[PDB]
């Protein structure tokens, strides 16, 4: 039920708090700290899945900016303008959304 089930704690804590500036988040440099390049693709789905709030098989605009605090509860939330360009990157098909394969894409990509 906790990312601390799926990836290391300091692992955790050195990827977030390399994004506590503001704008400054980047996802590829996050998701190598954080170490889901390391991981399985079904602990990626895992992770996908713990990002989705409401259980739609999607990671919407409003669910986005709250990936921080799927890894850290402490954390902050993201910027519209850090969440906008985050869709942005990850939206493949323009639904405005983001879903597990999409998700998939963006951890392999980094
Ligand atoms: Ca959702
Ligand atoms: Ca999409």
Not at 13 to 31: E, Q
Request: hydrophobic share 40%; no cysteine.
């Amino acid at each position: 039920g906790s990312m601390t089930d799926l990836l290391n704690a300091e692992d955790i804590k050195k990827a977030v708090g390399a994004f506590s500036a503001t704008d400054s988040f980047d996802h590829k440099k996050f998701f190598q700290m954080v170490g889901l390049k390391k991981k399985s693709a079904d602990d990626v789905k895992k992770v996908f899945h713990m990002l989705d709030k409401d259980k739609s098989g999607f990671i919407e605009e409003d669910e986005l900016g709250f990936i921080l605090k799927g890894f850290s509860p402490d954390a902050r939330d993201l910027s519209a303008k850090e969440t906008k360009m985050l869709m942005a990157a990850g939206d493949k098909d323009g639904d405005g959304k983001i879903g597990v394969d999409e998700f998939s894409t963006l951890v392999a990509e980094s």
